[PDB]
């Protein structure tokens, strides 16, 4: 379970960090627009499901 | 600062020692030349008084040290020490082998007033206290046991036991005579109209006259050898 937690944390922090920077620099929309992200939010899926929940 | 004055025409300070703790109990032997003094920590030094200096140390103990007593018959080979206590215990030492003979943890307050005698080495002892228990023991030389407790209702200070086998007790300005091997107060002085109580009993003429020094600054005489063959 030590090598399991090593491998699982090693792939998880990598995909979390790349999703965080991907939502932190997602400036371009195809028609001119700039997506407001908010500070230190980690995921496009997170803001998507948040804006679905705020209906 | 321990000092000794030779009472004779040379009234000079013969010996002077630097003891460890400020002490509040001394006893010399029934013979001469043995003086025991224990401080207010656990240390009971004993001193040969002729060429005055420490002959035994006796770290030994715990707490501040209550009254104590010798066991002295002239030209013996026994020479025990009694060693009462504040937290209730009696730890008997000898003086010929410097060893704790028997450890006894049984009491509940300051063990004032203990006494040692032999009746045919039998050597029965008796230890009173600020608790109301006088608690005599058989006290063999090798291994010891207990006998009766016989419970006087006082706060006994200097329970001078083994009169003619009859015990004494003081501590409410009440000099109770109590039989041994059974319990009955049989002689007991008049309770005064003060609150002050017995500080000390003092034997004169081989346990026949009794001096009584009070908590007040007075000192009385009893004549036990008449008032035991006499009630009150």
């Amino acid at each position: 379970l030590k090598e399991d937690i090593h491998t699982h944390m090693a792939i998880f922090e990598q995909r979390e960090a790349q999703a965080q920077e991907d939502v932190q620099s997602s400036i371009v929309d195809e028609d001119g627009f700039t997506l407001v992200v908010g500070k230190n939010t980690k995921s496009l899926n997170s803001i998507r499901k948040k804006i679905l929940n705020k209906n | 600062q321990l000092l000794k004055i030779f009472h004779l025409k040379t009234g000079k300070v013969v010996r002077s020692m630097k003891i460890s703790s400020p002490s509040y109990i001394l006893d010399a032997d029934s013979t001469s030349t043995l003086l025991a003094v224990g401080g207010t920590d656990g240390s009971i030094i004993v001193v040969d008084i002729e060429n005055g200096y420490i002959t035994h140390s006796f770290k030994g103990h715990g707490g501040t040290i209550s009254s104590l007593k010798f066991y002295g018959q002239l030209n013996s080979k026994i020479w025990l020490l009694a060693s009462g206590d504040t937290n209730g215990m009696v730890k008997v030492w000898d003086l010929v082998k410097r060893k704790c003979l028997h450890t006894l943890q049984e009491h509940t307050s300051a063990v004032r007033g203990l006494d040692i005698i032999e009746v045919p080495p039998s050597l029965n002892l008796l230890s009173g206290g600020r608790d109301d228990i006088i608690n005599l023991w058989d006290f063999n030389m090798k291994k010891k046991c207990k006998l009766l407790k016989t419970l006087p209702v006082n706060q006994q200070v200097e329970s001078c036991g083994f009169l003619k086998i009859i015990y004494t007790a003081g501590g409410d300005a009440i000099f109770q005579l109590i039989d041994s091997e059974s319990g009955s107060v049989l002689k007991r002085t008049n309770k005064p109209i003060e609150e002050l109580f017995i500080i000390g009993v003092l034997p004169i003429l081989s346990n026949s006259q009794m001096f009584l020094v009070l908590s007040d600054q007075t000192l009385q005489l009893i004549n036990v050898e008449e008032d035991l063959k006499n009630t009150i």
Partner: protein
């Protein structure tokens, strides 16, 4: 004073010389609750165990202000003395319980300086038992790192926010606990770090402390619960021999 001063009409009343009370007094020793270590804290004089205002009920009201370093053996908190109420006397050992806590005043008088603002809060909160506590909390502004200005002042509308969140979270930390649990979570100083973690979002907040717990109403005795806080015990025979 001396012989040359005065008689002053008060020394004519005679003196009632000596009672020598320390031959009559009696030693007990105190047993602290078992949330701490080293529960023996010292000894206490009382009176002689007689009738007519006996010892076991002339007792059982007092408090003892012991130091937390004397309880824990660790000099990391030499301050923060506590007060133990002696409650149930049981066979020469005064079984005590928690009654209060206070900082030694030198610690807070050396903590407070100028060019920073301090925040106070205090709530009346009932525990999961029926004790009620005026529990306090002190807080201080941190000079932020890489700062330049001497001030580090709070805007006094941050002060209401910090005091609201600190009263809310320590009200939660009391109300989700009993008194023994409150002592065992106050000793290793953890609501301070909880305040700092939940309150570092709004302001940087130099060292947080609680500094006072005042009990204002006690439920009942519950002798069995007080014996459960230490360990059981059954006083039994000693030999008659008469």
């Amino acid at each position: 004073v001396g012989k040359n001063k005065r008689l002053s009409k008060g020394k004519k009343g005679q003196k009632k010389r000596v009672v020598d009370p320390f031959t009559r007094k009696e030693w007990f020793d105190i047993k602290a609750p078992s949330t701490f270590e080293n529960r023996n804290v010292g000894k206490t004089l009382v009176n002689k165990s007689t009738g007519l205002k006996s010892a076991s009920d002339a007792l059982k009201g007092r408090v003892v202000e012991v130091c937390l370093a004397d309880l824990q053996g660790s000099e990391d908190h030499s301050f923060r003395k506590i007060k133990l109420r002696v409650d149930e006397v049981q066979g020469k050992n005064l079984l005590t319980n928690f009654h209060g806590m206070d900082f030694t005043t030198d610690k807070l008088r050396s903590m407070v300086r100028k060019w920073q603002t301090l925040i106070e809060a205090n709530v009346t909160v009932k525990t999961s038992d029926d004790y009620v506590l005026r529990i306090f909390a002190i807080a201080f502004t941190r000079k932020q790192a890489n700062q330049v200005k001497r001030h580090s002042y709070a805007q006094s509308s941050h002060i209401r926010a910090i005091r609201k969140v600190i009263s809310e979270i320590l009200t939660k930390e009391v109300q989700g606990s009993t008194l023994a649990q409150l002592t065992s979570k106050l000793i290793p100083e953890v609501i301070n770090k909880e305040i700092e973690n939940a309150t570092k979002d709004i302001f940087p907040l130099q060292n947080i402390h609680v500094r006072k717990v005042k009990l204002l109403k006690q439920p009942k005795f519950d002798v069995g619960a007080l014996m459960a806080l230490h360990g059981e015990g059954s006083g039994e025979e000693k030999g008659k021999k008469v």
